[PDB]
């Protein structure tokens, strides 16, 4: 079980740790989060009490280093940093734990929610989407635009998701225009899976990461990416059976976790109606169709 200590909490802030959120008051004696499960990526995220604008946060994996949070009064945000002195870090963390100045990551014996939302998400792939090679962790916020959004403006602060565009020469073989537009199997299986992602695990990892950025930061380009990656599968007549079964589980847990009040902005009516009721895969997503019809029947 790992720990992310905080130097202090000088400004009042809502701190989220994966799907959990808690409030810290201005100058409250808070020194971080302990008992963080090893084996998963995690995200620690922030919304200031005074400015609910710009939710922001950090994706990290405690196996890759010792990380802590320290507020920067010049840049006005809680910053993740890496401590290279392992003995200093261990000593700091032990003191804070002995003084009980840390919140405990929940340990519900039954709950697989975070595993199910991050099953295919790897820190090494996050760091290729979010390019800042000098750090082992990755900053994301509400305002960051995607490479595709920037084509339609600062490249270093962009989300480098894989560009998907159904009306593009990459998606459409000369001479198979109607075939490839109406059945996207060649774009899914040859171009994207064999060509770019290499396997379906990397494809699902990017889809899961895009969803989580949409949900936790309201990042609009990430929501676009998530829906595009869903639509590409649903609009393919030929999809490996294991991928369909896994997609159904992935989306079920995403829809289950989505806050009920954010469905209006985080779910695209057209994509979901097409995917569940019109697409080649309309009958292949039983768990997702059932939870959608019981939780968000209005959208449909």
């Amino acid at each position: 079980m790992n720990t992310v200590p905080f130097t202090s909490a000088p400004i009042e802030v809502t701190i989220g740790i994966d799907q959990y959120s808690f409030n810290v008051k201005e100058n409250q004696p808070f020194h971080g989060i302990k008992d963080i499960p090893i084996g998963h990526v995690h995200v620690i995220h922030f919304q200031h009490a005074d400015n609910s604008s710009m939710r922001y946060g950090y994706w990290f994996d405690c196996r890759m280093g010792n990380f802590y949070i320290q507020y920067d009064p010049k840049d006005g945000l809680y910053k993740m940093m890496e401590e290279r002195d392992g003995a200093k870090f261990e000593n700091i963390v032990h003191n804070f734990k002995e003084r009980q100045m840390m919140v405990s990551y929940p340990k519900i014996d039954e709950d697989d929610t975070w595993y199910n939302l991050t099953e295919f998400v790897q820190m090494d792939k996050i760091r290729k989407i979010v390019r800042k090679d000098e750090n082992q962790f990755s900053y994301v916020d509400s305002s960051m635009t995607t490479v595709q959004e920037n084509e339609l403006s600062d490249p270093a602060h962009s989300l480098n998701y894989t560009v998907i565009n159904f009306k593009s020469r990459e998606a459409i073989r000369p001479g198979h225009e109607m075939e490839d537009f109406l059945d996207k199997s060649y774009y899914l299986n040859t171009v994207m899976l064999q060509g770019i992602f290499k396997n379906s695990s990397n494809y699902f990892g990017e889809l899961q990461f895009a969803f989580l950025n949409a949900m936790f930061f309201g990042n609009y380009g990430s929501s676009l990416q998530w829906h595009a990656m869903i639509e590409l599968i649903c609009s393919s007549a030929t999809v490996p059976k294991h991928m369909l079964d896994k997609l159904d589980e992935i989306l079920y847990y995403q829809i289950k976790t989505l806050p009920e009040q954010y469905s209006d902005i985080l779910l695209n009516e057209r994509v979901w109606n097409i995917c569940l009721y019109s697409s080649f895969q309309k009958n292949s997503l039983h768990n997702t169709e059932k939870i959608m019809e019981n939780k968000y029947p209005e959208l449909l």
């Binding site: 009306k167 020469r169 459409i172 225009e177 109607m178 537009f181």
Partner: protein, 237 residues
Amino acid sequence: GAMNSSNYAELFNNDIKLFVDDTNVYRVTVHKTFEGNVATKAINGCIFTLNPKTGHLFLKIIHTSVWAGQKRLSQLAKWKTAEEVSALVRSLPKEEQPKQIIVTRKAMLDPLEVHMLDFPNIAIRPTELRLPFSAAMSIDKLSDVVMKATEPQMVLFNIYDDWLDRISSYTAFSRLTLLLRALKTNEESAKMILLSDPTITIKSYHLWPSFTDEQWITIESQMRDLILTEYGRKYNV
């Protein structure tokens, strides 16, 4: 974006453009079978591709053999249309290629866009005008070439005959759309109006009769009356 009454003179500027109408591509007769079921029989069709400034009409005849063994023919027809329009553009010298293609039905936007991905600088646009190009098969010489075709064929016409020698392309288009709207609303009467007087003939190299300027005014008035009437005979007014 879309083409409407606000940007109507754009049709007659010096940027090459084409209208594409697909309403006569897939044509059928519906009939009963010996068992008393219903079946369709395809008949030859055509793509109506028109430069509104010059009157040049690229009439690609769609022979019924293109549908043999194919499914979902109404969907295929849009894609076949887009394939043929793309082939036409590629066949034209660069300086003759259109800068814009305006489709008369919005369902042609995606098929045409996908077929024209190689031409990112050609704009594919819808229109809010309700143009009467479906009535092109009411022009006898066009119907004749379509129905006689035994294989796929492209035939070139000038749909304005020689009118541009005396009138502008705005006026020629307005005359054409008036004639076609009349033919669409009441074909028999429109054709009576056009051919009543046997001393006015259609030249071998023309589509419409050789009306003098004064006769065109009379004809045009007769067509407006027809359209207004039928509009009464229709809504009772």
